[PDB]
Design a protein around this ligand. Structure first.
Ligand SMILES: CC(C)C[C@H](N[C@@H](C(=O)NCc1ccccc1)c1c(C(=O)NO)[nH]c2cc(Cl)ccc12)C(=O)NO
Ligand SMILES: CC(C)C[C@H](N[C@H](C(=O)NCc1ccccc1)c1c(C(=O)NO)[nH]c2cc(Cl)ccc12)C(=O)NO
Length: 86
């Protein structure tokens, strides 16, 4: 699998949910992002596919006020703008 190196702000976010490393697979990045979204309760309680991220680090990184977990290609792109491959 492709190994990626999150930029400093994304890495800070990942490590806040127990990520240990400086290089990751995209699946690991998505896993830790999910953990962040879950533990901070950023998902809509009625519509769990909706993530709210205005005035959160996640929003500043992704460049959106909210997104749907179903927007896979977009999420991949939003994550990728915070990476570099290694
Ligand atoms: C509220 C949400 C975090 C719940 C979580 N959903 C995730 C999920 O939909 N993953 C499929 C997927 C596939 C490709 C791109 C984005 C998302 C998911 C996960 C995940 O690790 N699910 O286990 N991580 C995510 C990160 C982002 Cl930014 C968006 C979605 C996910 C879940 O546990 N469903 O049982
Ligand atoms: C070899 C090839 C099939 C790649 C595929 N992995 C993709 C992947 O990196 N998934 C994690 C992920 C997916 C979407 C955003 C961020 C992170 C991936 C998957 C996938 O189904 N992984 O199991 N789905 C993707 C959707 C988009 Cl838009 C972009 C990437 C993926 C894989 O390893 N599948 O077992």
């Amino acid at each position: 699998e492709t190994l990626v190196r999150p930029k400093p702000l994304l890495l800070k976010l990942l490590k806040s949910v127990g990520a240990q490393k400086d290089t990751y697979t995209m699946k690991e990045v998505l896993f830790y992002l999910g953990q962040y979204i879950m533990t901070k309760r950023l998902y809509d309680e009625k519509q769990q596919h909706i993530v709210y991220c205005s005035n959160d680090l996640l929003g500043d990184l992704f460049g959106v006020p909210s997104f749907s977990v179903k927007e896979h290609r977009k999420i991949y792109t939003m994550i990728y703008r915070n990476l570099v491959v290694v």
